[PDB]
């Protein structure tokens, strides 16, 4: 199950955001701790129950930035998903990553990672002006 496979299974009051879902706009609910869960581990990123994969984030993120604040945000927002019901957890997972210092470069981890399984990049493609340029046309495809 791909990205593209989660976001086609949206309920309509959420396909029809699409492209805030897809900037990383956080939208509350149900239906979003539902598909950030789909779409996080699409991409691998946390475990069935929705905890976030610590290894699976911290080489990545300090290959695109070197920051050793990527260890203690990983860390403070595994510390928080472990804490809510499974039903949630992936999404605060996302949620924290986002709202902290290490937002910008999971975005761009989670841009890369998105690409490589589409076969649209590489697999040691890095965060580029090409990238950059590959994926907003990439967006601009499915109207965002
Ligand atoms: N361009 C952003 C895109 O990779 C994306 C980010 C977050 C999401 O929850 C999503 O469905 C898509």
Do not use: W
Request: glycine share 4%; with cysteine.
């Amino acid at each position: 199950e791909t990205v593209q496979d989660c976001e086609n299974k949206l309920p309509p009051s959420l396909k029809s955001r699409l492209c805030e879902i897809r900037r990383y706009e956080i939208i509350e609910g149900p239906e979003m701790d539902k598909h950030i869960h789909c779409v996080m581990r699409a991409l691998d990123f946390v475990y069935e129950d929705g905890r976030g994969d610590y290894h699976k984030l911290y080489d990545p993120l300090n290959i695109i930035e070197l920051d050793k604040r990527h260890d203690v945000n990983l860390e403070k927002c595994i510390g928080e998903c472990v804490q809510v019901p499974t039903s949630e957890r992936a999404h605060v997972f996302y949620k924290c990553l986002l709202k902290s210092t290490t937002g910008r470069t999971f975005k761009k981890v989670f841009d890369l990672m998105e690409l490589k399984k589409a076969g649209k990049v590489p697999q040691h493609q890095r965060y580029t002006a090409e990238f950059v340029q590959i994926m907003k046309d990439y967006d601009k495809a499915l109207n965002c």
